[PDB]
Write a protein that binds this DNA or RNA. Structure first.
Length: 234
RNA sequence: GGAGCCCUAGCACAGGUGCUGCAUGGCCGUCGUCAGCUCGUGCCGUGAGGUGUUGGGUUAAGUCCCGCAACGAGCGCAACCCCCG
């Protein structure tokens, strides 16, 4: 089930590379590797979810990041089925602070979505049409998952604040609550709602997301079927 | 008697390739057709400021890509002009 399944092979993050605030989240250093306790998970996986249900109902919004490939393609699908924004490829500065300013790149799509139907293809000639294609392509690609926010979020969900603190400290200046999955390499002082564990365990990912999104759907109504991401493993 | 025009006398005068391009306006060359010059928002710094323009690669090129606390734009490259296929 929860930790029952998790208790399988989905913990323990690296070895002799850590930031000594995970002291209250580590069982033992047995056999060289560092191992994260799971009694504390439940004692921390609750309060997290518990106060999502205080926020998931009142129309709050959530952000999913994942500039690590072994989570990039996962956040992807698990974000649409969630219906909440996401930044799969790579995050870049300002998104939450320069919300107005980043949006012009998104609004651009509106002034670019006019084209692919409207009678200016016959007007707008090719040499800039062609070389704007990839521009439109790479504009959508890096920004799909942000093309659906004009209101600024109500949360942040991060696979690894060590990898994505750059997208956290932005939220931190906005007094916007920040949640994140944390590993032995993390820094569990800046995260508001802690979800410790191995973030680079490809396995310890897919199950985290549905179980995270299951609350999203259950907040909205009618849990469904996710995606058997096991094929994305080996 | 008067307007214009002409010559002769007094004028106000103009006139000078005389001087200073180290006093200037305008115009011209060099770097150089080099590829650089900057702004709005954001971030780092007490602050001047930095980032953006830096790193790898590519091209005639700040041309473009990856990454990057940055994302976009303006002047410039280009292209809109002309001759040839």
């Amino acid at each position: 089930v929860k930790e029952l399944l998790e208790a399988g092979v989905h913990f323990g993050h690296e070895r002799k590379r850590w930031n000594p605030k995970f002291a209250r989240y580590i069982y033992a250093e047995r056999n060289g590797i560092h191992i994260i306790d799971l009694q504390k998970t439940m004692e921390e996986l609750e309060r997290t979810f518990r106060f999502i249900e205080d926020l998931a109902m009142r129309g709050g919004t959530i952000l999913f990041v994942g500039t690590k490939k072994q989570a990039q393609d996962i956040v992807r699908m698990e974000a649409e089925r969630a219906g909440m924004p996401y930044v799969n490829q790579r995050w870049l500065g300002g998104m939450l602070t320069n919300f107005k300013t980043i949006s012009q790149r998104v609004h651009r799509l509106e002034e670019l979505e006019a084209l692919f139907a409207s009678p200016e293809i016959e007007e707008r000639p090719k040499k800039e049409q062609v070389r704007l294609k990839h521009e439109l392509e790479r504009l959508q690609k890096y920004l799909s998952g942000f093309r659906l926010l004009k209101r600024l979020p109500d949360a942040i969900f991060v696979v690894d604040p060590t990898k994505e603190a750059i997208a956290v400290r932005e939220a931190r200046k906005l007094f916007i609550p920040v949640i994140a999955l944390a590993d032995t390499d993390s820094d569990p002082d800046l995260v508001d709602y802690i979800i410790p564990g191995n973030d680079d365990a490809i396995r310890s990912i897919q199950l985290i997301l549905s179980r995270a999104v299951d609350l999203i759907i259950q907040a909205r109504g009618g849990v469904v079927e996710p995606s058997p991401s096991y094929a994305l493993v080996q």
